[PDB]
């Protein structure tokens, strides 16, 4: 049940039953933690952190060896972005759609998609303000959205 679509896909990742560090691995916990910190300074999103670590370095799930989620590790070590990754990606997509619309005003489909993205951004922002991830006076303005992204 897609929130803004009629699709009913169920594609996802099925984590293993064994919630333990890998039997054949030498991650050494702290080495991976500093490795994540190095990649965070390099400037890649936590999704890219897990993808690169799983595909190349060979750690299936980082929390299995580290004991905490990578976002928790980044927050604990201080490299915590002010805007959450999902909200940042949504606002960046909205900015790209708005730029496309302002250069090409006849794209009614893009206008409809911008409305959907705007609604999704507002719902996500309301959730984050309620939980406390963002200041209660966060708000979202299209004029300053470009400065918010950059």
């Amino acid at each position: 049940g897609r929130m803004h679509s009629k699709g009913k896909g169920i594609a996802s990742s099925a984590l293993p039953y064994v919630r333990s560090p890998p039997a054949w691995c030498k991650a050494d916990a702290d080495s991976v933690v500093e490795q994540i910190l190095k990649f965070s300074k390099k400037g890649m999103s936590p999704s890219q952190i897990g993808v690169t670590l799983r595909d190349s370095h060979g750690i299936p799930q980082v929390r299995f060896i580290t004991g905490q989620k990578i976002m928790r590790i980044l927050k604990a070590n201080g490299l915590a972005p002010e805007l959450p990754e999902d909200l940042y990606n949504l606002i960046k997509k909205a900015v790209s759609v708005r730029k496309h619309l302002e250069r090409n005003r006849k794209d009614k489909d893009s206008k409809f998609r911008l409305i959907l993205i705007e609604s999704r951004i507002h719902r996500l922002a309301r959730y984050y303000r309620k939980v406390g991830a963002l200041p209660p006076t966060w708000k979202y303005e299209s004029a300053t959205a470009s400065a918010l992204v950059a």
Binding site: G1, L15, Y17, R19
Partner: protein, 129 residues
Amino acid sequence: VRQSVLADCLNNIVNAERRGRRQVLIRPSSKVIVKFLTVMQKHGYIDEFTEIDDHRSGKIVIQLNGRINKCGVISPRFNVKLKDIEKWVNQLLPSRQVGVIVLTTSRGIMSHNEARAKDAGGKILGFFY
């Protein structure tokens, strides 16, 4: 989206019983589902059930033996006092001797008859006969 898991469990069980199958797989599982099933088990309508403990809500495989006609849920959870138990029994049960109404009494999930014995009302969960 999913609203109540007991309703889905009872709908699947009654569908399997009507089809005539001797087993049914229920997902998701919960404490309310477990308490409902043990009440049905101590009353003899449902045989052994194995709770598959996953690192999730968890699944359960139930062995049936027929002898039940329909198990259903009562949504919303109406508040049932001691005096309203008879009215609910007349409204839902086939007769005064056959049929069980499950109430989430403050003492715990229990049948309407033993809820009367304990002299405590609650909220109506469902029924089976």
